Every structure is written in structure tokens, then in C-alpha cells.
Amino acid sequence: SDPRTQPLEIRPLMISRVMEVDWADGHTSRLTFEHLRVECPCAQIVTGKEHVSVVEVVPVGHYAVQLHFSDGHNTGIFTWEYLRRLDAE
Ligand SMILES: [Cl-]
Ligand SMILES: [Zn+2]
């Protein structure tokens, strides 16, 4: 019941390379495909993903989405809580 992490709609935008998520607190996250890829849950310097895109967004139960990326990587289950957290980190 946390409005911050209840998604209303998800819009992966291929041209601008950002995934928008509207949340129940009225916030919309705009998370770049690049950012999502380099923070994919599935000191090092993680780089080289500026040209990667999200090819598909598949819901996982009610708690997460699986993002499929253009570099073949398709593990990466992102919980709603995690996606919201990426808006600041
Ligand atoms: Cl971002
Ligand atoms: Zn980050």
C-alpha cells in the first residue's frame, strides 16, 4: 500500500531511450535504458552501455518487471521498489 511503489503505467520510449513509470504518489520516473542496464540487479567501473535499449518489459507477478536488453541480457528482474529507488541512486 505504498503509493510511491504502486505503478499506474509504464512507457518504454525507444526514440528517447528512457522508460517512464507513473506512480500512485503522482510522480513519474524517467529512467534511461542505459541507467537501467548498468544497474541491472542481474570498486568496479561499469561502463559501455550507452547504446543499449530495452527491447521488452514483461511483468513478473505483481511485484516486478523483467527487462530484456538489446545486448542479450534478459535476467534483470526489477522490483517496483528498486525502480523507484533508481530515481535518486
Ligand atoms: Cl536515469
Ligand atoms: Zn543509479
Side-chain angles (χ1 to χ4, degrees), residues 17-19 30-36 86-87 89:
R17 309 223 286 288
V18 308
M19 197 181 65
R30 298 179 96 267
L31 292 168
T32 64
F33 291 173
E34 180 189 27
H35 190 190
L36 291 161
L86 290 180
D87 235 359
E89 80 169 50

Side-chain angles (χ1 to χ4, degrees), residues 36-41 43-73 75-80:
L36 291 161
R37 180 59 189 91
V38 304
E39 304 270 29
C40 181
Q44 81 280 37
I45 300 161
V46 183
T47 192
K49 299 300 176 185
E50 68 269 23
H51 281 114
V52 177
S53 70
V54 172
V55 298
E56 208 169 356
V57 173
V58 180
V60 173
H62 291 305
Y63 74 98
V65 280
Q66 182 189 41
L67 303 189
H68 299 252
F69 294 101
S70 67
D71 61 347
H73 296 272
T75 332
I77 300 293
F78 291 72
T79 67
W80 304 130

